[PDB]
Amino acid sequence: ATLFIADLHLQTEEPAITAGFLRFLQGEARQADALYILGDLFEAWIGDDDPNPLHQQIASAIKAVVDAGVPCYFIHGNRDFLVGQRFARQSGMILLAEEERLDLYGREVLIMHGDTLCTDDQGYLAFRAKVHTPWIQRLFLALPLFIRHRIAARMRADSKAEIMDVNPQAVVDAMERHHVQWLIHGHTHRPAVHELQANGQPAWRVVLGAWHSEGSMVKVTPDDVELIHFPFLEENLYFHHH
Ligand SMILES: CC(=O)N1CCc2cc(S(=O)(=O)N3CCN(c4cccc(C(F)(F)F)n4)CC3)ccc21
Numbered sequence: 001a002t003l004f005i006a007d008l009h010l011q012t013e014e015p016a017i018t019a020g021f022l023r024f025l026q027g028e029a030r031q032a033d034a035l036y037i038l039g040d041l042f043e044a045w046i047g048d049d050d051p052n053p054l055h056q057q058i059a060s061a062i063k064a065v066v067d068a069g070v071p072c073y074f075i076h077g078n079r080d081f082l083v084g085q086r087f088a089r090q091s092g093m094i095l096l097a098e099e100e101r102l103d104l105y106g107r108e109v110l111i112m113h114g115d116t117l118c119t120d121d122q123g124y125l126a127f128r129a130k131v132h133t134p135w136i137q138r139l140f141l142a143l144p145l146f147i148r149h150r151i152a153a154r155m156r157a158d159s160k161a162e163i164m165d166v167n168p169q170a171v172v173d174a175m176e177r178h179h180v181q182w183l184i185h186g187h188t189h190r191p192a193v194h195e196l197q198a199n200g201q202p203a204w205r206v207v208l209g210a211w212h213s214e215g216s217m218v219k220v221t222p223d224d225v226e227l228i229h230f231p232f233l234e235e236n237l238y239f240h241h242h
């Protein structure tokens with residue numbers, strides 16, 4: 001099986017999600033053919049030189065999966081688009097492009113984070129265009145760490161003061177550009193399986209869940225596609241009347 005996850009939004013303020021991801025990495029991921037993280041692994045990222053200990057704890061945990069023989073891959077999300085090759089080397093992860101076409105046991109699948117499909121949020125797309133401009137990124141990354149922290153903290157509060165769903169035509173365009181009948185993405189926090197038509201044939205769009213109260217993954221096997229929801233921690237069973 002090949003595993004897909006996204007939208008964990010890891011942050012030191014949410015240690016239960018971190019513990020859940022660590023348990024996922026120690027158990028399920030070790031048995032996978034491969035692990036793909038389709039963006040928003042972290043709630044924020046201001047550069048690979050950030051000494052945030054959560055970053056090293058996560059890198060070491062992913063690296064243990066990689067060293068166990070499971071290749072791990074990363075597509076950037078809207079939150080953690082600054083994840084770079086230093087963190088890739090620390091974690092053993094391979095950084096992929098914003099759109100990738102995979103062969104999963106014979107079926108061709110397009111994978112992406114999903115934010116680029118939400119073309120009806122022109123306010124977000126303007127923001128995305130700005131912070132994805134390379135010279136703007138290079139300028140931001142050159143700022144002192146403590147400056148980047150304050151910029152990011154203010155921008156998060158400014159954004160706080162309702163995720164738009166995908167545009168149906170944008171989905172078709174992407175599935176026809178890549179000539180695939182399968183698409184896996186996250187971003188929209190709406191775990192689901194959708195049927196559509198692309199390239200004159202039935203096609204499917206599979207959406208990952210965010211790690212809010214439970215975990216979420218997509219498991220692709222040679223036989224089927226599985227959207228799986230599971231608790232963060234080990235739920236120890238314990239023991240009504242007739
Ligand atoms: C919709 C959405 O995705 N948002 C909304 C608010 C927000 C914050 C963050 S962030 O905290 O991780 N951080 C902010 C600072 N940033 C950059 C990068 C390049 C240039 C600039 C600047 F300063 F020139 F603009 N900033 C890195 C990312 C991530 C996503 C999101």
Ligand SMILES: [Mn+2]
Pocket residue numbers: 007008040187188189210
């Ligand atoms: Mn998300």
Ligand SMILES: [Mn+2]
Pocket residue numbers: 039040077078079113115186187188
């Ligand atoms: Mn997103």
